[PDB]
Amino acid sequence: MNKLVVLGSVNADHVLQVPSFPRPGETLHGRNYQVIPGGKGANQAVAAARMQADVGFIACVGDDSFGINIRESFKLDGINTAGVKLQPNCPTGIAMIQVSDSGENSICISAEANAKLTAAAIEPDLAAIRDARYLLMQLETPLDGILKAAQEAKTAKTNVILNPAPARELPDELLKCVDLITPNETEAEVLTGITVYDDSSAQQAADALHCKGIEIVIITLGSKGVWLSQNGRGQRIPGFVVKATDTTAAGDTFNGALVTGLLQEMPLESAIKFAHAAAAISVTRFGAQTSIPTRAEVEAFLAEHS
């Protein structure tokens, strides 16, 4: 029984660099086309697995070549893929990601196989959720699946970490089941209404989540580190200073590394700093999973930062 169970999405990132932002009409010449394994659930389970967590993964992929292959690849990564279903006659979820040389990114996502991860779909996964010490989830799969998983986890005294990404609002009923939540600045706002300008707001944002029943709130702040509140007692834990070139799986990495630290009986504060280190590395590399570091790369990183 995996001590960590990650539930979440799988995309194929079709990345293309384009000179201008895409507009309808004339065929625009792109370049450096790649298909990168992505998806917030996949990226986080890959994060944890690469941080050597005892991790199983609940997800829905397609029966295209990509879905068939990425499942095998997860195995190679050390992820228990028992909970990874292949959806008949569905492509795998895809992100059509056009990186514009003029900075501004064009993103077109289609759920595809991901829309299939329903509360009923995860039924055989429930037991793995009960036996886990931690359940990690995001929001790139249907809500009923996410909610069903958290509920199962509360009664089993499994700890529930929710990375509320991508940004979307959530019912009290799910928040109440979440032991630890890790929104970024955008997502805390969406979830609370409270926009996070500084410590005061971050703490109000946090307290709003504490009142939704979430003991621990971690608001990731981009380069500003993290705002950690545990039972009202808040504090900013800063991250590392790196030349950021792509932050695509940054948040995915942080959550994977964070939960792996806690499973190693790290104090929360230390687990967090550890996760900072992993995510920092990732923000320095291109693409989703292509940027997610190993435990070795992290220890190496931490050593080099003294």
The site for ligand ADP (CB under 6 A) is made up of 11, 13, 27, 38-40, 43, 95, 97, 107, 109, 165-166, 184, 220-223, 225-226, 239-242, 244, 247-252, 254, 275-276, 279-280, 283, 288
Q: Work out whether 40 is an interface residue with ligand RIB (CB under 6 A).
A: yes
14 binds, among ligand RIB, ligand ADP, its own copies, none (CB under 5 to 8 A by kind): its own copies
Marked catalytic residue, from 54, 77, 179, 252:
252
Q: What is the nearest approach in angstroms of ligand RIB to the Cβ of residue 95?
A: 3
206 neighbors 180 (Cβ within 8 angstroms): no
- Which range touches its own copies (CB under 8 A), out of 46-54, 163-171, 211-219, 292-300? 163-171
Half-sphere exposure of 104 (CA within 13 A, CB side): 4
Alpha helices in 165-216 (DSSP H): 172-175, 185-192, 199-211
246 makes contact with ligand RIB (CB under 6 A) = no
- Please list, in sequence order, all residues whose beta carbon lies within 8 angstroms of the beta carbon of residue 58, skipping any fewer than 6 positions away: 5, 6, 7, 8, 41, 83, 84, 117, 122, 125, 128, 149
CA 210 – CA 186 distance, rounded (Å): 18
DSSP 115: G
Interhelix angle 250-263/40-50, nearest 10 degrees: 40
Task: State the amino acid at position 300 in one-letter form.
Answer: A
Q: How far is CA 280 from CA 124, 243, 251, in A?
A: 36, 9, 10
249 binds ligand RIB per the rule CB under 6 A: yes
Residue 252 a catalytic site member: yes
Binding site for ligand RIB (CB under 6 A): 9, 11, 13, 27, 38-40, 43, 95, 107, 109, 140, 248-249, 252, 288
Residues with catalytic function? 252
Binding site for its own copies (CB under 8 A): 14, 16, 18, 21-34, 40, 65, 91, 94-96, 98, 100, 104-112, 140, 165-167, 184, 186-187
